[PDB]
Scaffold this active site. Structure first.
Site, PDB file in Angstrom:
ATOM      1  N   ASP A 507       0.852  -1.177   0.000  1.00 31.92           N
ATOM      2  CA  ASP A 507       0.000   0.000   0.000  1.00 31.92           C
ATOM      3  C   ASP A 507       0.890   1.230   0.000  1.00 31.92           C
ATOM      4  OD1 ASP A 507      -2.286   1.565   0.021  1.00 31.92           O
ATOM      5  OD2 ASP A 507      -3.293   0.315   1.506  1.00 31.92           O
ATOM      6  N   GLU A 545      12.294   5.100  -8.354  1.00 29.17           N
ATOM      7  CA  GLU A 545      13.211   4.638  -7.327  1.00 29.17           C
ATOM      8  C   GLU A 545      12.463   4.121  -6.106  1.00 29.17           C
ATOM      9  OE1 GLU A 545      16.455   4.795  -4.247  1.00 29.17           O
ATOM     10  OE2 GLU A 545      14.403   5.584  -4.269  1.00 29.17           O
ATOM     11  N   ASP A 577      -3.383  -2.687  -3.564  1.00 27.20           N
ATOM     12  CA  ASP A 577      -4.590  -2.152  -2.966  1.00 27.20           C
ATOM     13  C   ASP A 577      -4.839  -0.750  -3.484  1.00 27.20           C
ATOM     14  OD1 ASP A 577      -6.527  -0.903  -1.400  1.00 27.20           O
ATOM     15  OD2 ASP A 577      -6.025  -2.091   0.370  1.00 27.20           O
ATOM     16  N   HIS A 709      -1.686  -1.578   4.709  1.00 26.97           N
ATOM     17  CA  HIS A 709      -2.353  -0.292   4.822  1.00 26.97           C
ATOM     18  C   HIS A 709      -2.146   0.345   6.182  1.00 26.97           C
ATOM     19  CE1 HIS A 709      -5.359   2.578   3.275  1.00 26.97           C
ATOM     20  NE2 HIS A 709      -5.667   2.729   4.550  1.00 26.97           N
TER      21      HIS A 709
HETATM   22 MG    MG Z   1      -4.454   1.703   1.055  1.00 28.85          MG
END
Ligand code: MG
Ligand code: MG
Length: 734
Positions: A507, A545, A577, A709
């Site tokens: 994420d 990068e 995600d 996340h």
């Molecule tokens: Mg997320």
RNA sequence: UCUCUUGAGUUGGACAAAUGGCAG
RNA sequence: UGUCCAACUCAAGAGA
């Protein structure tokens, strides 16, 4: 093929009206005028000159044209003339092509935005609200209108009109009532007022406390006429007040709206302040699937019970369907939750909280040395809490010994930081900080110190959650599992038939807060049963990068795999995600090449079989469970990889809900090399739904997505820096 | 910041591009 | 001038 067949078939229904249009002979017509004329109004007027020879099915964007009926010429070349200047316009019609329907979606969207007008609906932003089907709420004087948002697309099963119903409130008391009960200034501006006589919306710009109905506006650039006479003659109504304000609106001349026949919209500040209003409007907005399907069938009925739509569709010749998309999905079996010396098959709700709260977790770390940390005001709330951990850890296998309570001088961040600095040591396992309240700066200051400077797995908990007995028991029981998570002791497991199949979840911090530094997030299992993880981060102000540090991160994770399993993963499955419908091409074209590049380095042509997956939580789709003829939420685990998927993806309903409709989860598979039959990948994505140690049960998205996340959302909101590398093998971010 | 879920109202950003309205 | 995305705040459900 995309198909998967594992579980017991279940008859379902989605909110789609399939179309059967056969788009032929409607080939694109190119409009060309030698005289430079760029004005939509003027071009339409010019085109109208030879209207009869063309048809009655205009789709004119101002540059090209579509019509189904053939005009009596392939490359028609006629002439027209303007009227503002009179310039003779040369018509050039050209048959472009009929290659593919990459824009027929746009054509259909246009004709439907016209059809929804044909039904006397009042467009407001994205919504085409109704006015004949309100949902009265005659206790707040409010009123609630239903709003449809049709968005046609092309699916596996032809074309489908998605449909999402949204409600937007329309008060009923006259705006002068609001003015009266505001005195005995700033709420109106920005309020989307509408008049009732014609049901026309009106955004508002400003108010002028100097005008009245006595003022007369020149009608149609003709003669001055007072607003009273204007409204009496045009709408057969009168106005009582004589010195009231007037409401001013100007589009991209000035429009005067009288504040007695105006009716506000949205909600005021005091309107949202009350909670009874919210509870009243939650019944009609948070709709179980029964009333939801009923409101959809109401829409379709209104659509087909009006000729205009019928003959317009027939003019375009495409037939619209008369009922939702009946379908037949399937339901994957329940999942065997494991423990140490136990097991259980998840409920039909897939929520094993009760079983987990009294069974022995797999690996439990004895919390011998640790220290609470609280301000003196919260002595009791802390002490009472600590005892509870001793009454709920022994059941689940954790052994807890007396902590080392600490009394910070005062709540100011400086004091907490000094206490932590003087307290950390090699002998502590965990630190518990109890805050008097939520102050983002304090929490970030404490977490920098507990995760970067002096690395010790921390656990914060505010001084409000631990002040409510008859619910504090479960709060202690959740904090205990979270704390055991941040020490390397896995809690529960699930049977996995895929051997040597690593898993990864990525994420990227979705914000523009800290210099636009583009935080990342990484997490990757390290044992065949997805019980342990390996969390790393990468934060750089570049979009390539940064991919390079993701390369390094996943190489490190794959190394940690070998250091704890004496082999290497035959398969790697990456769970992206949040990647919307904006840049899904970038992943499969740059990221995947980057990944598969550098894997052979660690072995003899080591080319582990990669397979990416993009995971969306918010979507307009909604799968329904149809038992007999009533509608109900699907039980957990109802795959649908038919008739609404586009390209080797699938919906999945892993969550269970007690409030309204359940939202499936859309898993696109944007790169496949794993040689996993889609059945096994679907069942794996179902299993991983069970392995998020912050919730005993099933979560909307897999475990790696949520873990990554939370890691990214920590590093990008509090730390602003890489957390130390001592905390990699644990889950310090929960 | 005990944790997940479903609704509501605000907010900016990646794109494309200049409006169905005869209102007043 | 409109759309497809994604964050934070409020309210509610479930937690012996
Ligand atoms: Mg997320
Ligand atoms: Mg946490």
């Amino acid at each position: 093929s995309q198909r998967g067949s594992s579980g017991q078939p279940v008859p379902v229904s989605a909110n789609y009206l399939p179309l059967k249009g056969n788009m032929d002979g409607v080939f694109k017509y190119a409009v060309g005028f030698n005289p430079p004329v760029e004005d939509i109004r003027s071009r339409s007027q010019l085109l109208n000159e030879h209207k009869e020879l063309i048809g009655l099915t205009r789709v004119f964007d101002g540059s090209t044209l579509y019509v189904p009926k053939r005009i009596c010429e392939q490359r028609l070349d006629l002439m027209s003339t303007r009227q503002t200047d009179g310039a003779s316009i040369k018509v050039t019609i050209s048959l472009v092509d009929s290659v593919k329907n990459r824009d027929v979606v746009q054509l259909m969207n246009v004709i439907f935005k016209r059809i929804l007008r044909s039904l006397k609906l009042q467009r407001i932003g994205r919504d085409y609200y109704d006015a004949n089907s309100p949902l009265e709420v005659p206790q707040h004087k409010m009123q609630l209108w239903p709003g449809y948002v049709t968005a046609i697309n092309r699916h596996e099963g032809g074309l489908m009109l998605v449909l999402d119903v949204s409600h937007r409130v329309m008060k009923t008391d006259t705006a002068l009532d609001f003015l009266y009960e505001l005195y005995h200034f700033k709420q109106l501006v920005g309020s989307v007022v509408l008049t009732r006589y014609n049901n026309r919306t009106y955004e508002i710009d400003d108010i002028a406390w100097d005008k009245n109905p006595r003022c007369a506006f020149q009608d149609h650039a003709g003669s001055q006429i007072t607003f009273v006479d204007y409204y009496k003659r045009a709408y057969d109504l009168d106005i009582t007040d004589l010195e009231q304000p007037l409401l001013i609106h100007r589009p991209k001349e000035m429009v005067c709206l009288v504040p007695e026949l105006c009716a506000m919209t949205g909600l005021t500040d005091a309107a949202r302040s009350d909670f009874k209003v919210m509870k009243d409007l939650a019944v009609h907005t948070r709709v179980p699937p029964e009333k939801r399907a009923e409101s959809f069938r109401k829409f379709i009925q209104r659509l087909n019970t009006t000729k205009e739509a019928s003959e317009l569709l027939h003019s375009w010749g495409l037939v619209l369907d008369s009922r939702m998309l009946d379908m037949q999905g399937r339901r994957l079996p329940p999942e065997k939750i494991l423990f140490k010396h136990s097991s259980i098959v998840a409920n039909m709700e897939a929520d094993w909280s009760r079983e987990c709260l009294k069974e022995h977790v797999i690996s439990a770390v004895s919390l011998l040395d640790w220290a609470v940390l609280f301000v003196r005001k919260d002595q009791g709330k802390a002490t009472d809490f600590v005892n509870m951990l001793s009454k709920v850890c022994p059941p689940i296998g954790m052994e807890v010994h007396e902590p080392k309570m600490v009394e910070v001088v005062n709540d100011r961040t400086e004091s907490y930081l000094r206490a932590l600095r003087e307290l950390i040591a090699p002998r502590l396992q965990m630190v518990v900080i109890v805050f008097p309240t939520s102050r983002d700066d304090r929490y970030s200051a404490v977490k920098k110190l507990c995760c970067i400077e002096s690395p010790i797995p921390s656990q914060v908990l505010i001084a409000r959650t631990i002040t409510q007995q008859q619910k504090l028991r479960s709060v202690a029981q959740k904090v205990a599992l979270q704390m055991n998570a941040k020490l390397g002791g896995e809690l529960w497991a699930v049977e996995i038939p895929l051997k040597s199949c690593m898993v990864v979840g990525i994420d990227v911090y979705h914000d523009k807060s800290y210099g636009n530094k583009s935080i990342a997030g990484f997490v990757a299992s390290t044992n065949p049963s997805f019980t342990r993880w390996y969390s790393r981060t990468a934060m750089q102000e570049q979009s390539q990068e940064l991919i390079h540090e993701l390369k390094l991160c996943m190489q490190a994770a794959l190394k940690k795999y070998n250091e704890m399993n004496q082999s290497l993963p035959e398969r790697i499955i990456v769970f992206r995600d949040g990647v919307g419908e904006g840049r899904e091409e970038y992943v499969s074209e740059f990221e995947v090449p980057q990944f598969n590049s550098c894997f052979s380095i660690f072995g003899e042509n080591y080319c582990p079989k990669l397979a990416v997956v993009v995971v969306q939580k918010r979507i307009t789709t909604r799968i329904f469970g149809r038992s007999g003829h009533s509608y109900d939420n699907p039980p957990p685990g109802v795959i649908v990889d038919h008739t609404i998927t586009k390209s080797y993806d699938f919906y999945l309903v892993s969550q269970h809900v007690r409030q309204g409709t359940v939202s499936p989860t859309y898993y696109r598979v944007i790169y496949d090399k794993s040689g996993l039959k889609p059945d096994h990948l679907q069942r794996l994505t179902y299993k991983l739904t069970h392995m998020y140690y912050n919730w005993p049960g099933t979560i909307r998205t897999p475990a790696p997505c949520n873990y990554a996340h939370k890691l990214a959302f920590l590093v990008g909101k509090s730390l602003h820096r890489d957390p130390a590398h001592e905390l990699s093998d644990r889950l310090f971010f929960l």
